[PDB]
Amino acid sequence: QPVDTIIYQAKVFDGLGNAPVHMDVAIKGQQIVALGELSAYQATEEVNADGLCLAPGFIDVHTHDDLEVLRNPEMAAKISQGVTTVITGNCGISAAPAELANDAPDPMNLLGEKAEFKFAQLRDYIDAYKVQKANVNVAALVGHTTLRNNVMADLLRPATAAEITLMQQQLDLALSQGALGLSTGLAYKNANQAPSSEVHAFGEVLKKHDALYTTHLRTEFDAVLDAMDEAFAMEQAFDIKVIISHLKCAGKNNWGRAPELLAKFSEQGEHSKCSCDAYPYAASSSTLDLNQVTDDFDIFITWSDSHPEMAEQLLADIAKQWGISLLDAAKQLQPAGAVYHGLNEDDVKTILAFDKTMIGSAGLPCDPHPHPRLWGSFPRVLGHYSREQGIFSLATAIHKMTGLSAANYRLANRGVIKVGHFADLVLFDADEIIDNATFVESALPASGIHQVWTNGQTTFKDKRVLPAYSGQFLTSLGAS
Ligand SMILES: [Zn+2]
């Protein structure tokens, strides 16, 4: 008869892109149990949401939070944005299944330090998550580069057919233990010599488990359209779900080409199910890479192990202080992290507006001065691009971080405000929600989020991140 909580009089967005409905929402246990006008229900707690909006909890489909959720189960960077679920294991790197010999090969340092990789099997990682759980749900992909490192000591080559056989078996076991699918990061030096046929060797395993394929493209610069062909070939050959990560046309050469990327989806063939995600910024962030050094746009160093006095400075200013070229300064700064202001804002708007595009933060949790997407992506979409810029409605914006993402990743009973679905929810003020993180002050929490529930338990309330630790590990459904 009774319920734990009723949220009264909010503008409720279902997560499916439909117009909001003014109504009340009842939570009991982990579940949404009633929707409508509910003053006839007995609730332990009552939340007055008059003038506020209620949406499904946001799903961050592009994270490198594999080890961050173990180090930092409160997950304030995500929870303070309204994110209740993270997809881990992106761009070819995952915490599991991974056995390291001497070091963690690049880019696995984006996840954590080599000693943190303690999960020879995915089941080991799930056990570790279940020790404390976390404020976010976790669903995990397996990284192709991580699989390569398990069986190859020299990564600067194709894997042998025998090494491919081992990787197929390791993925098959990870999928059976609960992984969602496989990710690749083919632009990175330690995967770039994998030919398309090496990636294709995983297709039968993925198809057998009805699993996902996600990809950081082999290049996102001049030849990005060719790189997209590679991703479509997985869909064509195996009829599996493919997601292109952080879609962009990078480089001054390619500013204005976003329509070409949208039109490229017409080349998929018989199946038309490829999706993509993007973060809402015109600046990327990664290790300082000599191939990306240019004078075409600002490049900011975020950290440098060689010259920590140069952290948070513009590469052009560093070069001038040092009396050498941008490229020579970059060589001396390595290893380092950078933010590259190399995207065009109109391209970003077009990619965000594309109806296939989900919102993903691509936040780098080990960065000591992170790109502000780590703390602002989702309220930036709702407050900057929807309310202020008007490029889409609030219903559309919410859909692209909730119901669209749960559907594309097959997240059962999430992403939608519907009776019987999990009570992952965000209460916010539609007129005040906004990102506050800037490139200079990159960890400022967003405004406008009043309360967050993860599986029916409050993980954020009135600026407090709360250790409910009610997240669950979301094991894959496998085949029929
Ligand atoms: Zn990536």
Side-chain angles (χ1 to χ4, degrees):
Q1 184 226 3
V3 297
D4 288 331
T5 307
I6 290 170
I7 302 161
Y8 283 101
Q9 288 315 282
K11 248 175 122 179
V12 182
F13 293 80
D14 58 7
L16 305 173
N18 293 314
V21 176
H22 286 77
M23 73 174 174
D24 314 328
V25 180
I27 302 172
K28 198 211 208 319
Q30 299 177 5
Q31 298 251 309
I32 300 164
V33 294
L35 305 167
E37 308 303 296
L38 317 167
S39 60
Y41 281 75
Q42 330 314 146
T44 302
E45 185 197 347
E46 288 168 347
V47 181
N48 175 17
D50 184 57
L52 301 173
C53 301
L54 191 75
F58 308 149
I59 300 164
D60 190 353
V61 298
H62 200 274
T63 85
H64 286 305
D65 291 337
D66 303 43
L67 298 170
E68 176 73 2
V69 299
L70 304 180
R71 303 187 292 260
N72 174 33
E74 277 193 39
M75 290 294 290
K78 301 305 172 79
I79 285 290
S80 68
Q81 296 186 60
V83 167
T84 50
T85 296
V86 296
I87 306 312
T88 61
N90 285 106
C91 308
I93 52 167
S94 52
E99 279 175 334
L100 304 188
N102 42 311
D103 270 337
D106 292 349
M108 304 183 84
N109 57 315
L110 296 179
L111 303 186
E113 286 275 353
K114 33 175 226 203
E116 300 179 55
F117 291 85
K118 310 174 172 293
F119 318 108
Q121 299 182 57
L122 178 69
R123 172 57 182 274
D124 300 311
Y125 174 86
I126 300 175
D127 286 353
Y129 175 87
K130 280 178 171 174
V131 168
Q132 305 190 253
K133 322 265 191 311
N135 277 347
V136 296
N137 308 299
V138 173
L141 302 153
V142 176
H144 167 235
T145 310
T146 297
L147 296 187
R148 285 171 46 91
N149 187 65
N150 285 338
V151 301
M152 305 167 76
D154 173 19
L155 292 158
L156 308 184
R157 62 172 170 95
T160 65
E163 283 165 340
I164 287 170
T165 300
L166 279 193
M167 301 190 286
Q168 289 168 329
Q169 296 169 353
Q170 288 176 9
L171 174 69
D172 188 62
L173 177 66
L175 296 178
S176 292
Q177 291 178 347
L180 288 187
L182 178 83
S183 75
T184 57
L186 298 169
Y188 289 102
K189 73 163 180 182
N190 284 328
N192 184 250
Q193 296 193 52
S196 300
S197 51
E198 183 176 316
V199 178
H200 270 250
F202 297 99
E204 289 302 321
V205 167
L206 291 170
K207 181 180 188 177
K208 185 192 180 180
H209 290 266
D210 214 276
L212 314 172
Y213 175 68
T214 74
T215 181
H216 175 137
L217 296 175
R218 201 177 290 263
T219 180
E220 303 178 293
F221 290 87
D222 290 6
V224 57
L225 296 182
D226 295 342
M228 283 173 84
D229 283 336
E230 206 174 356
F232 293 163
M234 288 304 284
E235 182 184 20
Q236 308 159 173
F238 307 100
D239 192 31
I240 55 173
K241 184 69 180 181
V242 175
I243 297 127
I244 296 170
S245 305
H246 47 68
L247 188 65
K248 67 164 83 61
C249 36
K252 183 171 142 244
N253 276 357
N254 305 292
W255 294 341
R257 291 183 70 201
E260 293 185 51
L261 274 53
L262 269 52
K264 184 77 183 173
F265 286 84
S266 296
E267 308 190 8
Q268 297 176 62
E270 55 203 320
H271 310 119
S272 62
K273 247 278 208 183
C274 199
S275 301
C276 57
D277 57 68
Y279 50 84
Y281 298 84
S284 62
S285 172
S286 77
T287 63
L288 184 62
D289 187 73
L290 307 179
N291 287 333
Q292 294 190 239
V293 170
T294 176
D295 74 354
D296 288 336
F297 47 79
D298 285 359
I299 300 178
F300 278 89
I301 305 309
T302 57
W303 57 272
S304 169
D305 284 340
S306 296
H307 290 280
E309 76 276 10
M310 281 326 185
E312 312 188 56
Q313 301 190 36
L314 188 69
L315 185 56
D317 293 344
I318 294 168
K320 180 179 176 65
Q321 311 170 233
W322 284 357
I324 66 190
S325 67
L326 301 175
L327 177 60
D328 283 340
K331 289 173 169 167
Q332 299 188 31
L333 287 159
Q334 291 184 316
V339 171
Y340 307 83
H341 291 263
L343 311 185
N344 168 267
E345 177 71 27
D346 280 322
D347 286 333
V348 172
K349 285 176 176 173
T350 296
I351 289 163
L352 286 177
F354 193 31
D355 61 335
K356 299 186 195 300
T357 301
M358 307 166 274
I359 308 307
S361 73
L364 305 187
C366 305
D367 196 332
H369 189 78
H371 183 308
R373 61 200 196 191
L374 174 66
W375 284 85
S377 293
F378 291 85
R380 188 171 177 77
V381 169
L382 303 173
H384 182 84
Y385 284 103
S386 179
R387 177 185 70 245
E388 287 172 11
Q389 294 287 312
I391 70 175
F392 32 59
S393 69
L394 187 54
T396 285
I398 286 167
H399 176 57
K400 291 148 73 69
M401 58 198 65
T402 57
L404 174 64
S405 303
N408 282 333
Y409 286 81
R410 287 73 160 114
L411 304 183
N413 285 320
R414 299 183 190 276
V416 179
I417 296 187
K418 177 181 174 156
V419 169
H421 277 42
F422 288 104
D424 299 333
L425 299 156
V426 52
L427 183 66
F428 67 100
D429 182 323
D431 299 313
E432 101 175 288
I433 184 153
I434 195 64
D435 55 313
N436 291 310
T438 64
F439 289 105
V440 168
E441 304 177 80
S442 66
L444 300 182
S447 305
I449 307 270
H450 284 225
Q451 189 158 4
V452 179
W453 294 260
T454 300
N455 290 307
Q457 280 189 273
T458 301
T459 45
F460 181 89
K461 193 180 190 181
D462 190 22
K463 301 301 163 182
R464 319 184 202 79
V465 175
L466 306 160
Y469 297 164
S470 43
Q472 296 167 23
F473 190 95
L474 312 187
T475 70
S476 55
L477 307 86
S480 79

